[PDB]
Amino acid sequence: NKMEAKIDELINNDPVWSSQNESLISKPYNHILLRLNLIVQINRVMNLPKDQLAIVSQIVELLHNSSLLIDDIEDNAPLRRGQTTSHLIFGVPSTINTANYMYFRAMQLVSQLTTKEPLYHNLITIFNEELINLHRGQGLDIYWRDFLPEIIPTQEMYLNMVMNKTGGLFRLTLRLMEALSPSGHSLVPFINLLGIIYQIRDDYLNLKDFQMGFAEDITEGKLSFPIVHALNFTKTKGQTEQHNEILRILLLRTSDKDIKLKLIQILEFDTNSLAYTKNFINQLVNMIKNDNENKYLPELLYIIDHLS
Amino acid sequence: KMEAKIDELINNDPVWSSQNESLISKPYNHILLKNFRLNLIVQINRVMNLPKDQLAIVSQIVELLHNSSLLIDDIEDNAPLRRGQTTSHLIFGVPSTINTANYMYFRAMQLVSQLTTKEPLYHNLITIFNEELINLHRGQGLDIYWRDFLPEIIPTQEMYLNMVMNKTGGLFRLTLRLMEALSPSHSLVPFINLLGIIYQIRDDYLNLKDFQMSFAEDITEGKLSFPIVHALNFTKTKGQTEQHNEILRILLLRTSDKDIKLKLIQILEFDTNSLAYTKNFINQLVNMIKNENKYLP
Numbered sequence: 220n221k222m223e224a225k226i227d228e229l230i231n232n233d234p235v236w237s238s239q240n241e242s243l244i245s246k247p248y249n250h251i252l253l254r255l256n257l258i259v260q261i262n263r264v265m266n267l268p269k270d271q272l273a274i275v276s277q278i279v280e281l282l283h284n285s286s287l288l289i290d291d292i293e294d295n296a297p298l299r300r301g302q303t304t305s306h307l308i309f310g311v312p313s314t315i316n317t318a319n320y321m322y323f324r325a326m327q328l329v330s331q332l333t334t335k336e337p338l339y340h341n342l343i344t345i346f347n348e349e350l351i352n353l354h355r356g357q358g359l360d361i362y363w364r365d366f367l368p369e370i371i372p373t374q375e376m377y378l379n380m381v382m383n384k385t386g387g388l389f390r391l392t393l394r395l396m397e398a399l400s401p402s403g404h405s406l407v408p409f410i411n412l413l414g415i416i417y418q419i420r421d422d423y424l425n426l427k428d429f430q431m432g433f434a435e436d437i438t439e440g441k442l443s444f445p446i447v448h449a450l451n452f453t454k455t456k457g458q459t460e461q462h463n464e465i466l467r468i469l470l471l472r473t474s475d476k477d478i479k480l481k482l483i484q485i486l487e488f489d490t491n492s493l494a495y496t497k498n499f500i501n502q503l504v505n506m507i508k509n510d511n512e513n514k515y516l517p518e519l520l521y522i523i524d525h526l527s
Numbered sequence: 528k529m530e531a532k533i534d535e536l537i538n539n540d541p542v543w544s545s546q547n548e549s550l551i552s553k554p555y556n557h558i559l560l561k562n563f564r565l566n567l568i569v570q571i572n573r574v575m576n577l578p579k580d581q582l583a584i585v586s587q588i589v590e591l592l593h594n595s596s597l598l599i600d601d602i603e604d605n606a607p608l609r610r611g612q613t614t615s616h617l618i619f620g621v622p623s624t625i626n627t628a629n630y631m632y633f634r635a636m637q638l639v640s641q642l643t644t645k646e647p648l649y650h651n652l653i654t655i656f657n658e659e660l661i662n663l664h665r666g667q668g669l670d671i672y673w674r675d676f677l678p679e680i681i682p683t684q685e686m687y688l689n690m691v692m693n694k695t696g697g698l699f700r701l702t703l704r705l706m707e708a709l710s711p712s713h714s715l716v717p718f719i720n721l722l723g724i725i726y727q728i729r730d731d732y733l734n735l736k737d738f739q740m741s742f743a744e745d746i747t748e749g750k751l752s753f754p755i756v757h758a759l760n761f762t763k764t765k766g767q768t769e770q771h772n773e774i775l776r777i778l779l780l781r782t783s784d785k786d787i788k789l790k791l792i793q794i795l796e797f798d799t800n801s802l803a804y805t806k807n808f809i810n811q812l813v814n815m816i817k818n819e820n821k822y823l824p
């Protein structure tokens with residue numbers, strides 16, 4: 220009877236949750252807490268009041284960090300910015316849960332951007348759309364890597380994957396801002412380009428810093444821009460043994476330095492994928508540095524050079 | 528030319544094909560392999576009277592969340608089996624399974640926007656969805672924390688019940704709250720909360736019972752199960768130090784050894800009588816429902 224009473228009190232009330240509980244489950248996220256400038260540069264064109272901008276920034280910070288927590292689990296990464304990955308400290312289970320929890324806390328923050336219902340609807344849809352896009356590209360990248368050689372993506376396929384996986388957070392941020400603006404043409408194209416440059420450079424530097432960075436993308440088996448070029452080049456030029464050796468090294472998930480270095484030199488001297496990628500980056504970067512009529516642009520370059 | 532193809536890319540929406548859609552959907556399609564879930568929604572609709580059309584979408588949203596949460600739950604519990612079939616993450620890998628499951632959360636979210644076009648109502652439906660996914664994760668988070676930090680914290684029965692209100696109460700309340708918000712006709716939330724609690728305790732109980740008369744994967748997982756919480760607090764209170772530690776030691780083993788699993792169940796059967804205490808607890812919760820329609824409609 221005292222039990223029924225306690226049960227009645229329980230089910231007629233919201234779930235009990237303490238600040239203590241909140242702290243216990245935020246451990247994986249607080250650890251990774253250990254680009255505001257980008258939001259700021261973009262606002263020079265968007266003109267949102269500082270308090271609304273602070274919230275946009277918080278939503279993006281939460282999505283970005285939660286994405287990395289998941290990303291490192293999916294990539295089996297032992298390090299993130301020189302420090303141990305959260306999943307290795309607190310475990311995969313709590314890290315997945317906490318990262319997913321933060322996606323929804325970010326969602327909750329959108330309502331703090333406006334009281335006006337029409338705008339609200341648009342903001343949520345934007346948030347919903349780019350999160351869908353992010354998971355689509357992430358899914359492809361992961362599928363290509365874990366089922367290799369089932370699918371050898373072409374350069375076109377890679378770029379489409381990146382438009383989703385990486386362009387997703389860039390467009391989310393930008394689109395939220397454009398929708399909130401109380402103030403020319405949309406900068407989505409420019410942000411899409413920024414995202415592509417960001418990803419190819421990220422892929423590039425992962426190997427170049429090693430050759431000149433632990434080339435962890437090799438250990439991971441990732442279909443990076445240089446690898447995608449090498450695999451299509453070898454197939455095309457009939458370099459049968461080199462093509463297969465590239466596949467073989469990716470499939471070893473090796474941390475051996477010499478093996479990673481052998482692969483990088485294949486990309487350097489045999490397929491010339493490194494120079495190809497470097498030039499590719501330069502081309503995309505000149506496309507912005509060169510549109511004097513501001514076909515893409517509205518201190519935007521400083522950013523482009525620190526994109527890393 | 529290269530400039531041109533890039534120009535064509537960045538000015539279009541990201542490319543995504545039907546074939547891409549299928550690849551990402553594999554881990555999910557695998558768990559689809561629902562009749563009692565549909566039945567619960569149907570039965571409740573006799574009071575909400577949503578127009579079939581709209582009932583189907585709620586049903587679709589619930590199916591997505593329920594299934595994606597199980598894909599994630601099996602990874603978090605390192606479960607090898609789900610309803611007798613091999614778990615998704617063991618076939619498609621942890622990486623694709625996490626991603627596909629999370630993708631389905633956002634697909635479910637998209638379906639919410641298609642329940643209504645009325646602006647006020649839409650906002651409430653989103654807030655409902657948002658709030659219960661928050662609760663689900665909090666609850667799941669605490670359940671996982673207790674298990675993975677054991678023996679730092681041993682919960683009491685009350686802590687366990689509050690955890691369940693979140694972990695299991697969320698999907699139940701999410702379905703009910705949406706339906707009540709959509710109804711064109713007292714809340715049934717308190718009733719759905721009890722359904723969820725009865726649901727979780729019976730799930731914990733059967734996991735040990737089915738095996739006692741035979742996987743008891745909960746032991747292998749080291750779960751702070753309802754019978755386990757009772758046995759741990761019982762031995763502490765009765766000052767039975769060595770029995771208390773023995774339960775702790777078996778759970779910490781993460782053991783698949785049948786004999787050791789059986790040893791823990793006999794502690795629960797003969798020392799703390801925890802399985803019988805649980806049977807009784809569930810029967811009392813149910814009696815609350817069968818015995819003036821305060822909870823019932």
Ligand SMILES: CN(CCCCc1ccccc1)CCC(O)(P(=O)(O)O)P(=O)(O)O
Nearest residue numbers: 254283286290294384385388389417418421
């Ligand atoms: C999809 N994510 C966005 C990363 C962050 C992109 C970004 C967005 C907004 C602001 C700054 C950076 C990419 C993460 C990686 O690039 P990937 O796993 O694809 O190689 P990395 O593991 O190398 O860090």
Ligand SMILES: CN(CCCCc1ccccc1)CCC(O)(P(=O)(O)O)P(=O)(O)O
Nearest residue numbers: 564593596597600604694695698699726730
């Ligand atoms: C969260 N899950 C489902 C909760 C109830 C799911 C449900 C089913 C149908 C309709 C609504 C909700 C609780 C049960 C578990 O997942 P399972 O024992 O199946 O591994 P766990 O105890 O491990 O957390």
Ligand SMILES: [Mg+2]
Nearest residue numbers: 290291294296
């Ligand atoms: Mg990564």
